[PDB]
């Protein structure tokens, strides 16, 4: 049994709008990681407007056999306070095709920790 | 300088129409391979209708600094004569965004060698 996921969105970088373009985005499966299998479900790069869509499938086995999808975003958008450009991990709800995950505007100049703490 | 490519199409498998679904497709850069760098530009999986689109960027350096894109298709479509299910490599024209490569119907039950020879 294999389940597939599609995530879409539009990258925003208010601190440097050029940094929304040509951004490397990976859809990876933490369950596959636990199994030491290829965990890269899908890979895309954002376009000139910051748009992206990435679709991947996963088939897991053993104790953890439900796919656990994440987005890994490597980018050069300077964080608004610190000018950090740290990779951003998005926790993707476990919602599989025919369902599609539309993330909307994805901001690269602010991190989850900023607010959480 | 980085150039990006998008390839789209619809997988067909006349010998087993189920085999168009959930097919792993990689967009890779032979120039990056020559440089021993990550050569995987993009990765997608076909949907329930066999549709796919994959977008990737590449930035090459050294003697071979023009990206040289290919599609690697791993699938279970039985070849019409032999029942082979060998991976299919598509030679992608060096045509980069804003240009998009629309491949149309991509048949998985017949190989380039069949005719060529």
Swiss-Prot record, chains A, B:
InterPro entries, A to Z: Transthyretin-like (IPR001534), Transthyretin-like_sf (IPR038479)
GO biological process: aminophospholipid transport; apoptotic process involved in development; recognition of apoptotic cell
Top-level taxon: Eukaryota
Predominant location category: secreted
Protein's cellular compartments: Secreted; Cell surface
Expression tissues: Expressed in the intestine cells.
Record's keyword terms, sorted: Apoptosis, Secreted, Signal
Gene3D superfamilies, sorted: 2.60.40.3330
Positions of the UniProt region annotated as Required for mediating binding of apoptotic cells by ced-1: 111-115
Effect of deleting the gene: Loses ability to bind apoptotic cells and results in reduced ability of cell corpse engulfment.
GO cellular component labels: cell surface; extracellular vesicle
One of the record's GO molecular function terms: phosphatidylserine binding
UniProt effect for mutating residue 16 to A: Partial loss in ability to recognize apoptotic cells. Partial rescue of engulfment defect of the deletion mutant tm2078. Retains phosphatidylserine binding specificity
Stated role: Plays a role as a bridging molecule that mediates recognition and engulfment of apoptotic cells by cross-linking the surface-exposed phosphatidylserine with the extracellular domain of the phagocyte receptor ced-1. Important for the generation of extracellular phosphatidylserine vesicles that promote loss of the exoplasmic leaflet from apoptotic cells in a time-dependent manner. Required for the exposure of exoplasmic leaflet on the phagocytic cells surrounding the apoptotic cells. Does not affect the phosphatidylserine externalization in living cells.
Assigned protein family: Belongs to the nematode transthyretin-like family.
Subunit details: Homodimer. Interacts with ced-1. Interacts with nrf-5.
Protein's recorded name: Transthyretin-like protein 52
Organism: Caenorhabditis elegans
């Amino acid at each position: 049994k294999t389940s597939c996921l599609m995530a879409t969105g539009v990258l925003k970088c208010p601190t440097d709008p050029e940094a929304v373009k040509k951004v490397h985005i990976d859809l990876w499966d933490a369950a596959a990681a636990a199994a030491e299998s290829d965990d890269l479900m899908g890979r895309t790069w954002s376009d000139r407007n910051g748009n992206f869509q990435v679709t991947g499938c996963a088939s897991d086995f053993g104790p953890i056999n439900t796919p656990d999808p994440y987005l890994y975003i490597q980018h050069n958008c300077p964080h608004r306070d610190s000018n950090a450009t740290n990779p951003i991990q998005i926790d993707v709800i476990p919602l599989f095709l025919p369902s599609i995950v539309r993330l909307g505007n994805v901001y690269l100049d602010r991190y989850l920790e900023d607010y959480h703490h």
